[PDB]
């Protein structure tokens, strides 16, 4: 029936990456979660008037299993590359995540978005202009999100779906 998009979230650990998918798939208006629940990572949405099913893989917490990255990434059609705006190292990691995705997918043009995540009130160290410049150099969109207010979360996932649809 409706199209299912397999999305994969990648990025450094320990800096709130998991809040992106939790806030999306959540009961938006009840701050609660059981990730063990079958299809706590599947969500039917309407994007530009077209209903589809998002299947989101977020292996947050498994970052030390670095030799499993290919196994996980191979499942995906589009990728959210996430860094924290108060963690410069996580921003510097983005280049290698993108290179690894290109290699797994055997393509120079994989649907992907760059996401800068605000995970606390600690001082921002990556300015939006730096991240915009990086995204432009890659030819991909940039979305900033809050890990607390849900701002930007729908835009991040919907923009990625549009990237897949327009590939």
């Amino acid at each position: 029936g409706m199209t299912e998009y397999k999305l994969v979230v990648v990025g450094a650990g320990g800096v709130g990456k998991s809040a992106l998918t939790i806030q999306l798939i959540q009961n938006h208006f009840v701050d609660e979660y059981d990730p063990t629940i079958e299809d706590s990572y599947r969500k039917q949405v309407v994007i530009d008037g077209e209903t589809c099913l998002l299947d989101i893989l977020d292996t947050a917490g498994q970052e030390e299993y670095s030799a499993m990255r290919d196994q996980y990434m191979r499942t995906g059609e589009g990728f959210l590359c996430v860094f924290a705006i108060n963690n410069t190292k996580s921003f510097e990691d983005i280049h290698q995540y993108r290179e690894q995705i290109k290699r797994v997918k055997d393509s120079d043009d994989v649907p992907m978005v760059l996401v800068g995540n605000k995970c606390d009130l600690a001082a921002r160290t990556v300015e939006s202009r730096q991240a915009q410049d990086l995204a432009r150099s890659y030819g991909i969109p940039y979305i900033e999100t809050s890990a607390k207010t849900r701002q930007g979360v729908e835009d991040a996932f919907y923009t990625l779906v549009r990237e897949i649809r327009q590939h």
Binding site: E32, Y33, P35, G61, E64, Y65
Partner: protein
């Protein structure tokens, strides 16, 4: 009627339940949220024991109460005032008679003694299963030793004296089986010739057995203190989660070793034998319920350097393609078949830890620390119960030992495995991918030929065990 209670002014744990201090989930009640005072009251409740709650609380409480404060609170819980003589007792005493003290005796038997025993049970579980609090805070240990060592009165004496001894044993701190383990199996490498040990010269059965013993020991060593609070993801992860990280780094090294064995075997026929041997090891991992091992192999075969080796794939026997495909199917649909298989097998097993880590992290990130109700902040205990359900599952699979004999030299070989050498991760995984491109170039570049590198027979001895008398 119900027993009367001490005045809440002299004993804080007699406040009536209300929605301002405790909320229950919709045959003992299940607590959704409460003040720390109410959680401790129910932890040590006079009407029933709740051993699951004791484990849940002691596993997770540091997110809402410091260890020093917990000890102060359970000592306060323990010190229960006794009621004054009743009117009937008074009249007896005024006549020179001994009072019946019926209400006092009932309160001792049905309130004080169960609450005090359940406080001691918390202390006992705390010392036996969560002793790290005391290893990290010597003053906390002194306070516990003093509290236990000064409990008076004969009703508690057996357990006070026992807990005192348990503490002293923990400060200075054997398996029996239904049958004998199978005989250790040898192939080209012979016992004591560690210099020849390699993927194809050790027996594939014994490779799988010794890796399973190693991976089982690594799995069994991970304590809940390495998991609660998501501490393995934070800046102090090497301090707080060392056994978990050792376990993960072993898994990563084995996956990279499999990839390295494959792509450094440049001759096609030899590389087919290497891959075939790895899938035989995977078969034995499956037989042993070593799911960590299964996924180590699957991760290697799905890696970018190995996945693209179509000429190697073409020569793998159909039956072995099927073994690998069914192993990969365990991971599909967010590990649906893996989860069902783990829950159906007969242990011992070695679970894949990664799923637990993601579920603990998302449970802690996706639920609030407190619930606000009637102007009060209540501890969200349901969130902690969910974390402790995961740590309890982990612990349940840590109990059963494998009935397999250690081979000390093979064990040392796999403990010391270091496929990356002195190279950094990026340089090494780039090296593996460039080797893949060398041995099977991208179309339309022609496929080169390469000389053999192994001087010994490539034929596998197979994975069915042998048994001499």
């Amino acid at each position: 009627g119900q027993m009367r209670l001490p005045s809440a002014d002299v004993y804080r744990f007699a406040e009536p339940d209300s929605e301002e201090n405790i909320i229950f989930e919709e045959g003992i009640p299940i607590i959704k949220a409460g003040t720390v005072i109410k959680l401790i009251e129910r932890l040590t409740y006079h009407m029933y024991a709740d051993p699951n709650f004791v484990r849940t609380f002691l596993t997770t409480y540091r997110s809402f109460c410091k260890p020093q404060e917990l000890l102060s609170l359970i000592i306060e819980r323990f010190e229960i005032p006794e009621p004054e003589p009743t009117e009937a007792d008074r009249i007896a005493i005024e006549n020179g008679d001994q009072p019946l003290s019926a209400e006092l005796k009932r309160f001792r038997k049905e309130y004080i003694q169960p609450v005090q025993l359940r406080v001691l049970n918390v202390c006992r579980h705390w010392v036996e299963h969560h002793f790290y609090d005391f290893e990290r805070d010597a003053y906390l240990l002194q306070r516990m030793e003093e509290f236990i060592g000064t409990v008076r009165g004969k009703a508690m004496k057996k357990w006070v004296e026992s807990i005192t001894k348990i503490i002293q044993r923990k400060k200075i701190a054997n398996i029996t089986f239904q049958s004998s383990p199978p005989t250790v199996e040898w192939h080209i490498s012979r016992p004591g010739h560690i210099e020849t040990f390699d993927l194809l010269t050790l027996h594939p059965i014994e490779i799988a057995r010794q890796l399973t013993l190693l991976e089982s020991d690594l799995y069994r060593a991970v304590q809940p203190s390495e998991l609660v609070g998501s501490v393995w993801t934070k800046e102090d992860k090497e301090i707080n989660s060392p056994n978990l990280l050792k376990m993960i780094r072993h898994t990563t090294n084995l996956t990279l070793w499999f990839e390295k064995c494959i792509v450094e075997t440049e001759n096609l026929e030899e590389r087919v034998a290497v891959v075939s041997r790895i899938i035989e090891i995977l078969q034995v991992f499956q037989e042993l319920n070593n799911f960590n091992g299964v996924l180590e192999v699957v991760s290697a075969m799905n890696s970018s350097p190995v996945y693209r080796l179509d000429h190697t794939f073409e020569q793998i026997p159909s039956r072995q393609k099927k073994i690998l495909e069914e192993a990969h199917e365990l991971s599909e649909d967010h590990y649906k078949k893996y989860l069902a298989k783990l829950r159906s097998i007969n242990p011992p097993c070695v679970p894949f830890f990664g799923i637990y880590l993601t579920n603990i992290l998302k449970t802690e990130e996706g639920n609030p620390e407190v619930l606000k109700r009637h102007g009060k902040e209540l501890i969200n205990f349901s969130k902690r119960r969910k974390v402790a359900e995961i740590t309890g599952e982990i612990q349940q699979y840590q109990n059963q030992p494998y009935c397999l004999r250690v081979e000390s030299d093979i064990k040392r070989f796999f403990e010391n495995l270091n496929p990356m050498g002195n190279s950094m991760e990026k340089e090494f995984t780039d090296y593996l991918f460039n080797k893949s491109l060398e041995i099977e170039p991208r179309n339309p570049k022609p496929l080169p030929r390469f000389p053999k590198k192994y001087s010994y027979p490539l034929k596998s001895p197979g994975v069915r065990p042998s048994n001499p008398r």
